[PDB]
């Protein structure tokens, strides 16, 4: 018992060229039936399956981003020089010292030390509580790959198409030419927590002249610590008959603190299925912010005679149902697809009713029995859902009671207004 739920029939009078713009986290399923222009009853299946985008980025390990606390201390001496004694800030992890050597007058002098031009006033800015807050990587190069499978008549061919490669067969050619990317080289990816949580994108990550407060000021490189300088100047505040204290009118908040303050002003990104090594970082972008340009061309010299002997026979039967026919609940259909006269055959099964088809599922069937699950949403009260191939469907169906990041394009003519609100 078959029903008119076939695929788009395309006569091969001329070559079949196609251009695609695949989103980042999207898998395409384009299938038609190429018709011999010399015989209306000679048709061969053509299936095109393209996977998601795999982003391969050769990166440079920048290290760990450290967060510290600002501290300032002052050290006064009556006689000697500033380069004679030691100070507790000189032994810290990051420290910057500005000393007023031989600048002991009398207005800044304490009640002790009745001398002029003989003392020393050293000021030390150091950072404590250094703790790692995230990991930083720098993009060196980018590479985008997609896995494509074709099914023409009885032939099946798969390949991982790169930017400098194409899946070329005797009749079909699939090329990957362009890629619009959110990421580009010389960018800095910062992961605050683990990888799966995503991260942020920084462009002006300081490398040579880092200051306290800039993104990347304090870094825990594998060679050692890399401390920045300060954004400000020193000054000596003093009163009469008091020890001269040291002031610093500059930036006090660290780079991580300012980043948390204005985190909304930076670019965010997510990752899925991450794989990081000592040289690369592979992941799939789920935000669908990248587009790949794919060119497919099928010549009209298909030789319909060679692709017609012993085609792939497919039988199916609906065996189980679970869910509801309401628009929003969804139902799950189980099909027992039996493939014969072919070792492997790439096609797709649809869950159809008397009128429409509310779901599809692409699967590479093996010679024998195959269990296929199909998800669907919609239907009416008396909708008897069945499993369906191109034209042939199951003998019986089942009835129910009371997105997925896949794209399906089979060229089937959808039902008009007669199937709306019935």
């Amino acid at each position: 018992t078959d029903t008119a739920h076939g695929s788009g029939i395309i006569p091969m009078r001329t070559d079949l060229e196609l251009d695609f713009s695949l989103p980042s986290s999207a898998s395409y399923t384009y299938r038609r039936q190429l018709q011999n222009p010399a015989n209306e009853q000679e048709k061969i299946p053509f299936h095109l399956q393209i996977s998601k985008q795999v982003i391969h980025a050769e990166i440079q390990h920048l290290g760990h981003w450290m967060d510290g606390t600002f501290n300032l201390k002052t050290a006064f001496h009556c006689y000697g020089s500033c380069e004679k004694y030691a100070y507790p800030w000189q032994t810290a992890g990051c420290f910057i010292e500005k000393d007023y050597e031989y600048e002991s007058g009398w207005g800044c002098n304490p009640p002790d030390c009745p001398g002029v031009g003989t003392g020393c006033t050293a000021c030390g800015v150091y950072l404590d509580k250094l703790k790692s807050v995230g990991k930083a990587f720098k993009i060196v190069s980018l590479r985008y790959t997609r896995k494509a499978c074709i099914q023409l008549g009885t032939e099946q061919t798969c390949k991982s198409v790169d930017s400098n490669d194409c899946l070329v067969t005797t009749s079909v050619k699939v090329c990957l030419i362009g890629t619009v990317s959110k990421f580009q080289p010389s960018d800095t990816l910062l992961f605050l927590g683990p990888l799966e949580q995503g991260g942020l994108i920084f462009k002006q990550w300081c490398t040579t002249t880092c200051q306290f407060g800039d993104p990347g000021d304090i870094m825990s490189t594998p060679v050692g610590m890399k401390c920045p300088e300060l954004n400000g100047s020193f000054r000596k505040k003093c009163a009469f008959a008091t020890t001269p204290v040291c002031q610093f009118d500059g930036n006090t908040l660290s780079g991580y603190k300012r980043m948390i303050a204005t985190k909304d002003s930076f670019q965010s990104f997510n990752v899925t299925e991450p794989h990081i090594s000592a040289s690369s970082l592979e992941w799939i972008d789920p935000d669908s912010s990248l587009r790949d340009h794919i060119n497919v061309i099928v010549g009209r010299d298909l030789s319909f005679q060679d692709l017609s002997e012993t085609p792939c026979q497919v039988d199916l039967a609906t065996t189980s149902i679970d869910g509801a026919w309401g628009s929003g609940v969804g139902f799950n259909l189980v099909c027992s697809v039996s493939l014969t006269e072919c070792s492997t055959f790439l096609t797709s099964i649809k869950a159809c009713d008397s009128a429409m088809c509310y779901g599809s599922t692409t699967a590479n069937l093996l010679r024998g029995q195959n269990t296929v699950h199909i998800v669907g949403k919609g239907g009416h009260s008396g909708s008897k859902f069945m499993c369906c191939h191109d034209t042939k469907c199951s003998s019986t169906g089942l009835v129910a009671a009371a997105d997925s990041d896949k794209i399906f394009d089979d060229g089937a003519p959808e039902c008009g207004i007669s199937c709306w609100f019935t």
Partner: antibody, heavy 118, light 110 residues
């Protein structure tokens, strides 16, 4: 710690004989980077020759040496190889083994001289 | 061949020591950010200077910098020294084949 790469296996060969070049790398994970060979004639510009991936199933060559050059690697000993078919007089140059980062080359070796003369 | 050509202008006039110099590298096609600069000292092996058109390589002094507009890039050196007087190359790696440049040699004026 430090990255160090040394070439070897070069010298003088007859115009029409084979020659295999070796390159030993150390100081980094050899089984995580793409490797590549780049030669340069006497006082001329650089010329990319070949490129190999991590395992060795994907090898890129130039349209000139159609099957003449064969790049291989051994991750157990961290070594790079470049087998060459019967050469010609236009292959006399100095070959460097580089650490290909899918594009730019971030580390170059000392380089060995290959002379093809009679 | 339908490959991209990286025009690197040789024969640069000598410049005094301690000043600022700038070398250009023109492209036959826009590669947008996939540009690397190299340095080959006389007799020694090449050395990666700058990757990603703006990122300094490890072990390169802070007096090096690079930028550029569409298909027109530059490499700036501030505070010249007698050491970094060699030949510089530019390589694009946007689309295959990844081609190199011609080469520009500096000359310190003493």
């Amino acid at each position: 710690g430090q990255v160090q790469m040394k070439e070897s296996g070069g010298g003088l060969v007859q115009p029409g004989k084979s020659l295999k070049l070796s390159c030993a790398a150390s100081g980094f994970t050899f089984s995580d980077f793409w490797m590549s060979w780049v030669r340069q004639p006497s006082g001329k510009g650089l010329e990319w020759v070949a490129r190999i991936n991590t395992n060795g199933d994907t090898t890129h060559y130039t349209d000139d040496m159609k099957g003449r050059f064969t790049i291989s690697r051994d991750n157990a000993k961290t070594t790079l190889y470049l087998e060459m078919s019967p050469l010609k007089s236009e292959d006399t140059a100095m070959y460097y083994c580089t650490r290909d980062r899918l594009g730019p080359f971030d580390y170059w070796g000392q380089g060995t001289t290959v002379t093809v003369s009679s | 061949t339908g490959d991209i050509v990286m025009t690197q202008s040789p024969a640069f006039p000598p410049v005094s020591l301690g000043d600022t110099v700038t070398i250009t590298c023109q492209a036959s096609q826009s590669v947008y950010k996939n540009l690397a600069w190299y340095q080959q000292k006389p007799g020694k092996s090449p050395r990666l200077l700058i990757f990603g058109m703006s990122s300094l390589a490890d072990g390169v002094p802070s007096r090096f910098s690079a930028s550029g507009s569409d298909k027109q890039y530059s490499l700036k050196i501030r505070g010249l020294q007698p050491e970094d007087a060699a030949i510089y190359y530019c390589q694009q790696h946007y689309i295959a084949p990844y081609t190199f440049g011609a080469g520009t040699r500096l000359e310190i004026k003493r």
